[PDB]
Amino acid sequence: SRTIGIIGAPFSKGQPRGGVEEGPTVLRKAGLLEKLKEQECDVKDYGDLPFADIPNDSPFQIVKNPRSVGKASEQLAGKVAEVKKNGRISLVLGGDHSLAIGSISGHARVHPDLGVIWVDAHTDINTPLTTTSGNLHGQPVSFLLKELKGKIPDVPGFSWVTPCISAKDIVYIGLRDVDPGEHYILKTLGIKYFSMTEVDRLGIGKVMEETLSYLLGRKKRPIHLSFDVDGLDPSFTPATGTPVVGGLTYREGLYITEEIYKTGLLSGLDIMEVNPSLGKTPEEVTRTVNTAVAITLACFGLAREGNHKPIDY
Amino acid sequence: SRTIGIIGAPFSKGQPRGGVEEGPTVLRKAGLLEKLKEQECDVKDYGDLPFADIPNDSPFQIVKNPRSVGKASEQLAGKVAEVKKNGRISLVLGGDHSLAIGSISGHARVHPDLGVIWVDAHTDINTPLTTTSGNLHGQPVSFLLKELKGKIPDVPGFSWVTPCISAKDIVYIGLRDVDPGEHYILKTLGIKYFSMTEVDRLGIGKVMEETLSYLLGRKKRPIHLSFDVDGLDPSFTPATGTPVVGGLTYREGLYITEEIYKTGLLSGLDIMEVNPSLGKTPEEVTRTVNTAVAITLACFGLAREGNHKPIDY
Amino acid sequence: SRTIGIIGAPFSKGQPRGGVEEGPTVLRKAGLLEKLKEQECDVKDYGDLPFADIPNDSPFQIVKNPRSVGKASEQLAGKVAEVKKNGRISLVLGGDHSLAIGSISGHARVHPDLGVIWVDAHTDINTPLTTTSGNLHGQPVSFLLKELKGKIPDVPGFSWVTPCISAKDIVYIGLRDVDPGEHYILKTLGIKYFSMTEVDRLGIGKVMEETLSYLLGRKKRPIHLSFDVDGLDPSFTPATGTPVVGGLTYREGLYITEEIYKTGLLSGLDIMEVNPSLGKTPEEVTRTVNTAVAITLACFGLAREGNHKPIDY
Ligand SMILES: N=C(N)NC[C@H](N)C(=O)O
Ligand SMILES: N=C(N)NC[C@H](N)C(=O)O
Ligand SMILES: N=C(N)NC[C@H](N)C(=O)O
Ligand SMILES: [Mn+2]
Ligand SMILES: [Mn+2]
Ligand SMILES: [Mn+2]
Ligand SMILES: [Mn+2]
Ligand SMILES: [Mn+2]
Ligand SMILES: [Mn+2]
């Protein structure tokens, strides 16, 4: 049965807007733990990581808050590796996606053979040298790829990092806003991806069939799902820092996760970029969090066709 | 040509909210009869069933308004069997889905070999003993299935009922909120269904291909379509008692019905759960009724590709 | 590389509502030229056609403003043929779709072998004798089809017209509101089309596969894409004269154009029916124009998966 390890990560210095550090709060008050337990889920809450304050953290070239970001991920990596050693699926209620660096890092320490599925409107694969924004939530994957070692300069706060995944161990789904440098990296490293164009062409059904086959083809291995809230259309998750029109639908979002759950291989989960303060109205915030919870519950068994206990009703 | 028999069924005691008894009214004033006639439809209106008032109708265990519900369906069954004997397709403009009991019952009296397609966000297959809500609009199918005879206790008002369909003669489409007892019944009786997950996986095209093949495989037989308005997403039909996000789209709704029409086998039709009083704004009511009419017109020939008469334009 | 020739066509007398003549304006101020240049596009703006005023233009039977419409298209045809001779893809920022007559006409003068893809909720194939509205924006295709020569009476202003395409050289996508006479013409001339029903059945992926195969089967030839803004659902392009619910999605709209771009055969493009004055709110106008620009940029290379230059990033 799916045993979960909850990790609240109220961090925002991976991007300019601040309300994202409130993500764990709103998701918890939405009753996420209760609802997960309302299922057959064994849930242990490891709490909200107390993220230090690094007042002295000047830019590294154009890269912003490098020491703060580097420290949050280093802290998070230890936590994630802790829950993984406790035999539970790590659920990181995040702030910004920069935390992916620590989440996937800590997960790989315990399961070096993990495969990653990255649901996002963006690739977040900019290097400190290709980024034009300097925001680290758009650079996580670059720190994690072994093939990019030698192209990632020494950024204050990330000396603890060691690339744990190969370009062949990750699949993107939902892309619709990729920088030119990021696109160059995609095609150069031969990274497997399904942009909104491929979802439109093939259908989410075929997309998931190919994604799982691609990652679990040679052999079965742990799965790390890093779900960026903006991967879904802004009509479903408006309270997010960088929304892009024409995203994955609510149904597609649930299909992605229902399928992953069914592999029985989900090992790590990230629910990122939910920023309640960016909701233009009280219900945009409610609509976003509700959708984020729904997708989280899907990862752990909630099926739209229904569920029932091993009893004769 | 599609000859129709209209039956207004202003009934609401199958669920707690009352505005649903206004369904026939708003659908008629939307010009449904005129529009149907604006097509090549032969339409005879059998009127709005005068539903009796049963002041004395205490709960049966937890089941609410059993005598009122049982009587409305018994009345409706006779009407439907009447129009079927008049060689016309029964169109039941309903209130709540509890009326399905009488609609399908009366239809089967004349055509015991009918197949049922149930478009709904719910299975409505709870028994008086599995229901937790006590609302009869979520129990109709349980009264109709032969295999469940022996599990349906004697509820005041339904002694006239006799299960007329087998688990193999029904197909669900659109499910996204099924109780645990209902899910147990689905898998136990081996009922064929396409939840939103299957629609996402296969596409409405394949879904309809399999549905009709499944029901008309061995041989051609009359079709009864019980369309619950909440089977479509609440962005299309918001004025309904129990809306559930992530529903069938407008297009899918029309595709379902255009395909059924084309079989030339539509024998019975239910348009249920439209509740004008639940629309939060005047246009939510207009948007709901408009969609309900559009889907009704599709059942009787209106095609999105166009239609034309046997003349040289 | 895609070299473009911009042609502003502020014309509205092809239909009753007037704000459509503002289409070139809002599209230009949305930064369309800048954005196209922000790509690898060679853009030359031929300006906004100064459309004459024909005060004396009484109806022809029921056909409205025939001389004004006929003159605008005649003018436009010369312009389009001019840009085509300059070796550039004609981009007609239009007013109403009646301009299609001149756009496709002028294009065919230089490339008589062109194939047409018509994205629209309507067929716009009514003849002066089949039309019931008398509005010429719903009759363009009838003037262009060789097979309909002999059925198009002499309308003041169109004596310069000479049917340049056969029924076999055009494909419709998005149809959902076709008159009976139009439908008769579709089936009689055996015109290939994909109404919303076919998109629902096959998926936009298969639809585009069949469309391009159909038109480029025997051999490769120039493509003329006449994109009517109302071909997309009104939730994306509300500021348009004749919206119809259940249209093509934003994603589908981009998929259509991304695919066409990739053929490397786009030869002519029409962006029609954008009417800023019909937007009920300031953002409905913004949402419409934004979508119209997005689809225009897709026609010329902008891909959702990303783009990059031939350099080592
Ligand atoms: N993670 C995001 N939103 N990335 C977008 C943009 N390429 C940036 O790297 O700042
Ligand atoms: N028909 C509905 N809405 N059913 C839902 C719920 N299972 C109930 O049986 O009350
Ligand atoms: N182009 C449009 N909107 N056509 C619709 C209608 N058949 C008319 O020809 O006026
Ligand atoms: Mn993102
Ligand atoms: Mn991201
Ligand atoms: Mn329902
Ligand atoms: Mn129902
Ligand atoms: Mn149109
Ligand atoms: Mn048009």
Q: List, in sequence order, the alpha helices (H) in chain B.
A: 23-29, 32-37, 66-85, 100-110, 140-144, 180-188, 196-202, 204-216, 250-263, 282-299
Angle, CA C89 vertex, CA C87 and CA C95 arms, to 5°: 135
Q: Are B28 and B36 in contact (CB under 8 A)?
A: no
Chain C partners within 8 Å of A246 (Cβ): 250-251, 254, 304
Which method was used? Answer: X-ray
Alpha-carbon span B118 to B193, nearest angstrom: 9
Alpha-carbon span A228 to B238, nearest angstrom: 29
Residue of A nearest to B249 (CA): A251
Q: In this structure, what DSSP letter does residue A218 have?
A: S
Ligand 2 neighbourhood includes B135 CB (under 6 angstroms):
yes
Task: Using DSSP bridges, classify how beta strands A266-272 and A223-228 pair: parallel, antiparallel or unpaired.
Answer: parallel
Confirm or deny that B45 is annotated as ligand binding.
Answer: no
Q: Which residue's CA is the nearest one to ligand 2's atom 6?
A: B138
Structural domains present in chain C: 1-313 (3.40.800.10)
**Phi/psi-derived region of residue A191, left when phi > 0, alpha when psi is between -120 and 50, beta in every other case:** beta
Query: Euclidean distance between the first and final Cα of chain C, in Å?
Result: 21
Q: Which residue's CA is the nearest one to ligand 1's atom 5?
A: A138
Q: Among residues C5, A249, C141, C278, which one has the least CA distance to residue B248?
A: A249
Alpha-carbon span C58 to C269, nearest angstrom: 31
Alpha-carbon span C195 to C121, nearest angstrom: 8
Angle, CA B173 vertex, CA B170 and CA B179 arms, to 5°: 85
Q: In what order do the strands lie in the sheet with C42-48?
A: C42-48, C3-8, C89-93, C266-272, C223-228, C115-119, C170-173, C192-194
* Residue reference for tokens 């291909």: B209
Write the DSSP assignment of B244-268 as a string of letters: -SS-B-HHHHHHHHHHHHHHT-EEE
Write the DSSP assignment of C78-104 as a string of letters: HHHHHHHHTT-EEEEE-SSGGGHHHHH
Write the DSSP assignment of C172-236 as a string of letters: EE------HHHHHHHHHTT-EEE-HHHHHHH-HHHHHHHHHHHHHSSS---EEEEEEGGGB-TTT
Resolution in Å, one decimal, please.
1.8
Residues 6+ apart with CB under 8 A from C89: C2, C3, C4, C5, C83, C266, C267, C268, C269, C300
Q: Are A39 and A301 in contact (CB under 8 A)?
A: yes
Q: What are the tokens at A45?
A: 């809450």
Interface of B with C (CB under 8 A): 203-205, 250-252, 254-255, 258, 294, 303-309, 311-313
- Tell me, what amino acid is at C292? A
Residue of B nearest to C122 (CA): B305
Alpha-carbon span B45 to A249, nearest angstrom: 41
Q: Among residues A208, A186, A219, which one has the least CA distance to residue A259?
A: A208
List C-alpha distances in Å: A290 to A31, B122, B205, C52, C79: 10, 20, 30, 56, 54
Cα of B198 to nearest chain A Cα, Å: 9
Please name which ligand lies nearest the alpha carbon of C270. Answer: 9
> Across chain B, how many H-helices and E-strands are there?
10, 8
Q: Among residues A160, A157, A165, A158, which one has the least CA distance to residue A141?
A: A165
